[PDB]
Amino acid sequence: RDNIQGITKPAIRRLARRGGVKRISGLIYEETRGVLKVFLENVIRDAVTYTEHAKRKTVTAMDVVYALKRQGRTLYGFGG
Amino acid sequence: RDNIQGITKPAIRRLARRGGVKRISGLIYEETRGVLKVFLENVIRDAVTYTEHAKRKTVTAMDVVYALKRQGRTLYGFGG
Amino acid sequence: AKTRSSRAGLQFPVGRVHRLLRKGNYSERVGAGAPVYLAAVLEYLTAEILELAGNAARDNKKTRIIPRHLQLAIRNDEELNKLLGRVTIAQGGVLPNIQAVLLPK
Amino acid sequence: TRSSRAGLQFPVGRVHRLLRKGNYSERVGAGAPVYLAAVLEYLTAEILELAGNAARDNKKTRIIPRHLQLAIRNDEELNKLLGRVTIAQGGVLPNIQAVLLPK
Amino acid sequence: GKKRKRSRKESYSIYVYKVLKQVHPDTGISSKAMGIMNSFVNDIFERIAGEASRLAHYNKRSTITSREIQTAVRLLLPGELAKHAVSEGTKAVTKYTSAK
Amino acid sequence: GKKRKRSRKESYSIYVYKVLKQVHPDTGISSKAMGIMNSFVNDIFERIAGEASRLAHYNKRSTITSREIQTAVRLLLPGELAKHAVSEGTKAVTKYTSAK
Amino acid sequence: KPHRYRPGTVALREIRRYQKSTELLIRKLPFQRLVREIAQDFKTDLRFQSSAVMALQEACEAYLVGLFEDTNLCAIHAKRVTIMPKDIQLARRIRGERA
Amino acid sequence: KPHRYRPGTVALREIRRYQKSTELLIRKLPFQRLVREIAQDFKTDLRFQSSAVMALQEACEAYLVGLFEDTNLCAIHAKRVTIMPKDIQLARRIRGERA
Numbered sequence: 091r092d093n094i095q096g097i098t099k100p101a102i103r104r105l106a107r108r109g110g111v112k113r114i115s116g117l118i119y120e121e122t123r124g125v126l127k128v129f130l131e132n133v134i135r136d137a138v139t140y141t142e143h144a145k146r147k148t149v150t151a152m153d154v155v156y157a158l159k160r161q162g163r164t165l166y167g168f169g170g
Numbered sequence: 171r172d173n174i175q176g177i178t179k180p181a182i183r184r185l186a187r188r189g190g191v192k193r194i195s196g197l198i199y200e201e202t203r204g205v206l207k208v209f210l211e212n213v214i215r216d217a218v219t220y221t222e223h224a225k226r227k228t229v230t231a232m233d234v235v236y237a238l239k240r241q242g243r244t245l246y247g248f249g250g
Numbered sequence: 251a252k253t254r255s256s257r258a259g260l261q262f263p264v265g266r267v268h269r270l271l272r273k274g275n276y277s278e279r280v281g282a283g284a285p286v287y288l289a290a291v292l293e294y295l296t297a298e299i300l301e302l303a304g305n306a307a308r309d310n311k312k313t314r315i316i317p318r319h320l321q322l323a324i325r326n327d328e329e330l331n332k333l334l335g336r337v338t339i340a341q342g343g344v345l346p347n348i349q350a351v352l353l354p355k
Numbered sequence: 356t357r358s359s360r361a362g363l364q365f366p367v368g369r370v371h372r373l374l375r376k377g378n379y380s381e382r383v384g385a386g387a388p389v390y391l392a393a394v395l396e397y398l399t400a401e402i403l404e405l406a407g408n409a410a411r412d413n414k415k416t417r418i419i420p421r422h423l424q425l426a427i428r429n430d431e432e433l434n435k436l437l438g439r440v441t442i443a444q445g446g447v448l449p450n451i452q453a454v455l456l457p458k
Numbered sequence: 459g460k461k462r463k464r465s466r467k468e469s470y471s472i473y474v475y476k477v478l479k480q481v482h483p484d485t486g487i488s489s490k491a492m493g494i495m496n497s498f499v500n501d502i503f504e505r506i507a508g509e510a511s512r513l514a515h516y517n518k519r520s521t522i523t524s525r526e527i528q529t530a531v532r533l534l535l536p537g538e539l540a541k542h543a544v545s546e547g548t549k550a551v552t553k554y555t556s557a558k
Numbered sequence: 559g560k561k562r563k564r565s566r567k568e569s570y571s572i573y574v575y576k577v578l579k580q581v582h583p584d585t586g587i588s589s590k591a592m593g594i595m596n597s598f599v600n601d602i603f604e605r606i607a608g609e610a611s612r613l614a615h616y617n618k619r620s621t622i623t624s625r626e627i628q629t630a631v632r633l634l635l636p637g638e639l640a641k642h643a644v645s646e647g648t649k650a651v652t653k654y655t656s657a658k
Numbered sequence: 659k660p661h662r663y664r665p666g667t668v669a670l671r672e673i674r675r676y677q678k679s680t681e682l683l684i685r686k687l688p689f690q691r692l693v694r695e696i697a698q699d700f701k702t703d704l705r706f707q708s709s710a711v712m713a714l715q716e717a718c719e720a721y722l723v724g725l726f727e728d729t730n731l732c733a734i735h736a737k738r739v740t741i742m743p744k745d746i747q748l749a750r751r752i753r754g755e756r757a
Numbered sequence: 758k759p760h761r762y763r764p765g766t767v768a769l770r771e772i773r774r775y776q777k778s779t780e781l782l783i784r785k786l787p788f789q790r791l792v793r794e795i796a797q798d799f800k801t802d803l804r805f806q807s808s809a810v811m812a813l814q815e816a817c818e819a820y821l822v823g824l825f826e827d828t829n830l831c832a833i834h835a836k837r838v839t840i841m842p843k844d845i846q847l848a849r850r851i852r853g854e855r856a
């Protein structure tokens with residue numbers, strides 16, 4: 091469908107709050123969706139690359155952990 | 171006195187010129203010296219480790235090159 | 251027969267570590283002292299995180315370590331925070347830290 | 356020669372010898388070193404082409420670090436490939452922030 | 459019960475537990491927390507091993523010895539962490555050699 | 559005195575010249591510049607081979623083949639650069655397999 | 659009179675609340691659909707381990723939380739309290755994510 | 758008729774000049790003695806290949822130039838044209854050099 095809107099305003103505000111943000115421009119929310127999307131495209135492309143190299147039709151968490159390590163964004167706790 | 175002062179105000183001004191800076195606070199010249207010393211500290215520490223590991227009393231260029239690669243600042247042209 | 255771990259006074263599996271080294275494409279050959287040295291280092295580090303992660307639990311009035319407890323422990327120690335500066339601990343959350351200028355007067 | 360059969364200037368046996376000896380795996384496919392070499396050559400070819408054009412633009416018959424730096428940093432993709440690399444005696448691209456200029 | 463054993467999956471968790479009971483005997487550890495401790499041990503294994511692999515390779519040696527591990531450790535860990543980790547690795551080698 | 563010390567420090571420089579002469583006959587290259595090209599080739603050698611090593615190791619495979627080199631190249635190079643690198647790698651393995 | 663907090667007071671509460679907690683702050687389903695949607699551009703008819711989507715989410719939110727820290731520092735640096743697109747953009751430019 | 762350039766004009770000439778050139782901008786000897794001075798604090802009676810100290814300089818100069826570019830944006834971001842210590846500090850904070 092068209093799911094990027096499903097990253098709602100309030101959910102963006104929540105993340106920003108955890109990030110210590112007090113006041114938030116009206117323009118931030120679309121700007122953040124762009125960044126989040128860019129972030130996902132890159133991580134997933136490498137994940138999928140790993141999946142395809144393994145001749146599988148199902149992305150594993152390792153595919154994603156390995157992709158994340160490739161982006162200098164190591165993740166612990168999903169078999170890493 | 172300190173060799174750190176051998177990195178003069180005019181040399182610092184040139185560096186910041188190459189980095190496109192037009193106008194420079196007086197305070198920067200010390201601040202810069204701080205950063206630069208910490209930079210060298212970190213790179214030299216790791217180079218000398220490679221030297222001490224090679225059982226030599228002479229730091230080669232390669233020692234620095236491996237130290238600069240480890241620190242994420244890969245260097246071309248010096249026996250890479 | 252007693253394990254290489256027991257000879258070395260360790261909890262971590264010196265035999266396992268030695269095999270991982272042989273099977274991980276690091277070198278053609280592996281010294282006997284290597285896996286002993288390594289195992290010990292991994293155990294030390296592990297002990298240093300568990301000491302600090304236990305303290306965060308006890309301070310939360312909890313018996314069992316969770317991801318938060320690890321995170322707190324790690325980021326509140328300058329050295330571990332450095333070691334794991336580019337590492338994300340899932341279900342860790344962040345240290346409470348509100349910038350002073352954002353606070354009321 | 357292997358490099359000759361593959362259509363390549365870069366040494367296929369050298370690459371194959373470096374793969375075995377470089378602790379990458381137990382065993383190395385015979386397709387591997389052909390392919391890696393060909394890539395290594397292709398990339399080398401791309402930079403030299405552009406750095407050569409940078410030398411041609413400065414009335415020099417010889418490529419110098421600057422010419423390589425100018426080739427790599429004005430091309431989007433190479434710049435990204437070597438983002439975390441410093442090129443010795445390379446210098447920087449002429450670039451002054453707009454607000455710093457006069458009116 | 460049901461047929462076919464689930465396929466083996468190595469972990470460090472029994473050793474994390476053992477170290478846990480030395481350091482904090484009255485303290486347990488959650489499922490995901492252990493996944494983290496695992497991901498940690500594996501991270502640092504990889505880092506240390508890789509650097510030792512390189513050290514050995516730079517100085518034209520086929521063999522990773524306790525020496526390489528030490529040097530890698532000095533390169534990788536911060537100050538106090540390296541000292542202790544160097545002490546314990548030395549202790550462990552010393553102790554192991556004399557128990558042959 | 560002959561003073562025999564051909565240390566024989568290897569390099570890609572002859573093949574860089576050979577490719578330079580193909581893409582620009584009437585230009586050359588300084589010693590430092592040639593050093594940068596050598597660093598470059600080695601840098602990218604390591605990145606692909608290291609990425610190729612991981613593929614094989616992740617998939618429990620003892621053999622780095624040209625498939626592992628291709629996936630590595632897709633991962634490591636940006637969009638267009640990858641496409642052509644794949645093309646030239648594919649072509650090369652084709653042509654090699656036809657000859658002898 | 660009906661009670662009202664002044665602008666800024668609930669914002670600070672929300673901070674204290676979410677910094678205390680560790681739970682994911684994006685709604686799991688809309689995220690999962692987004693993961694599947696992006697993944698189609700690269701390869702169609704793809705399955706996902708559930709843990710792979712959780713991993714992907716854990717990673718997204720840690721990235722973005724972190725990015726908001728840097729962003730909040732860039733707004734503060736320009737004597738502002740409000741984050742703006744140019745703050746995010748500068749942060750990212752410095753991190754090296756963007757040219 | 759004594760000629761005078763306005764504040765900023767020569768700076769602008771210097772930028773243009775230095776961007777065009779590639780030659781190292783710190784005097785080499787004071788640099789070499791600083792490398793030797795710091796090297797003592799890890800190991801005494803250490804010798805340096807000349808190329809080793811040159812690598813270190815090429816390295817030191819690229820990193821600092823680069824940092825000045827990032828610092829310069831931090832100044833501009835705060836509606837200034839003058840770089841200041843806090844600009845360097847934000848930059849290194851965002852780069853992940855300091856905490």
Ligand SMILES: [Ca+2]
Binds near residue numbers: 400401404581
């Ligand atoms: Ca060409």
